[PDB]
Amino acid sequence: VSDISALTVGQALKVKAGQNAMDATVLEITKDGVRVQLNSGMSLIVRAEHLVF
């Protein structure tokens, strides 16, 4: 509710995998970033200053 940190789980946003965006789906969230599921097929996202939800 009101997003966990900067977003919520299952929010889904960008990770940017190799200079280009990719898309990744939130599995868990961090201090302000997340640990998403990469559309590349990974899971990680990054910190809030790197996500573009």
UniProtKB/Swiss-Prot annotation:
Alphabetical UniProt keywords: Chaperone, Cytoplasm, RNA-binding
Name under which the protein is recorded: RNA chaperone ProQ
Subcellular location: Cytoplasm
Role according to the record: RNA chaperone with significant RNA binding, RNA strand exchange and RNA duplexing activities. May regulate ProP activity through an RNA-based, post-transcriptional mechanism.
Domain of life: Bacteria
Entry's Gene Ontology cellular component terms: cytosol
Family: Belongs to the ProQ family.
Span within the parent record: 180 to 232 of 232
GO BP field: cellular hyperosmotic salinity response; DNA damage response; osmosensory signaling pathway; positive regulation of proline import across plasma membrane; positive regulation of transport; post-transcriptional regulation of gene expression; single-species biofilm formation
Gene Ontology molecular function: any one: RNA strand-exchange activity
Phenotypic consequence of gene deletion: Mutation reduces both the rate and the extent of ProP activation by an osmotic upshift, but does not impair transcription or translation of proP.
Primary localization: cytoplasm
Record note on domains: Contains an alpha-helical N-terminal domain (FinO-like) and a beta-sheet C-terminal domain (Hfq-like), connected by an unstructured linker. The FinO-like domain serves as a high-affinity RNA-binding domain, whereas the Hfq-like domain is largely responsible for RNA strand exchange and duplexing.
Annotated S-S bridges: none
